[PDB]
Amino acid sequence: GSSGSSGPETVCWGHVEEVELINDGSGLGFGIVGGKTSGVVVRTIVPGGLADRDGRLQTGDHILKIGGTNVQGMTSEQVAQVLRNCGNSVRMLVARDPAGDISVTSGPSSG
């Protein structure tokens, strides 16, 4: 680890990509939601903002860590304060296409 000590997290996933967002006064541009009992999720990502423009982070992205923080295990409510403290530049580990994922199917007023 660059600073003090740190180690990478390898978990059964299909697509692991790191997203680095820099608060430009406006904000990250994405909400969080404590879906799973371990980790945080992205409720939504403000359109044409910071995350959107970048085109790196995607909605409902299982957040593994935050700027080197152990969130996986705590409640989002506690993470909300972590993002702020983290500072201007934030680096969270988002992953998608998890082993045995659930396929989404549409059906407006069907059946």
Curated annotation (Swiss-Prot):
It is found in: Cell junction, Tight junction; Apical cell membrane; Cytoplasm, Perinuclear region. Expressed in renal tubules (at protein level). Expressed in bladder, testis, ovary, small intestine, colon, heart, skeletal muscle, pancreas and cerebellum in the brain. Residues 18-98 form the PDZ domain. Forms a ternary complex with PALS1, CRB1 and CRB3. Component of a complex whose core is composed of ARHGAP17, AMOT, PALS1, INADL/PATJ and PARD3/PAR3. Forms a heterotrimeric complex composed of MMP5, LIN7B and PATJ; the N-terminal L27 domain of PALS1 interacts with the L27 domain of PATJ and the C-terminal L27 domain of PALS1 interacts with the L27 domain of LIN7B. Component of a complex composed of CRB3, PALS1 and PATJ. Interacts (via N-terminus) with PALS1/PALS (via PDZ domain). Scaffolding protein that facilitates the localization of proteins to the cell membrane. Required for the correct formation of tight junctions and epithelial apico-basal polarity. Acts (via its L27 domain) as an apical connector and elongation factor for multistranded TJP1/ZO1 condensates that form a tight junction belt, thereby required for the formation of the tight junction-mediated cell barrier. Positively regulates epithelial cell microtubule elongation and cell migration, possibly via facilitating localization of PRKCI/aPKC and PAR3D/PAR3 at the leading edge of migrating cells. The L27 domain (also called Maguk recruitment domain) is required for interaction with PALS1 and CRB3, and PALS1 localization to tight junctions. This is InaD-like protein.
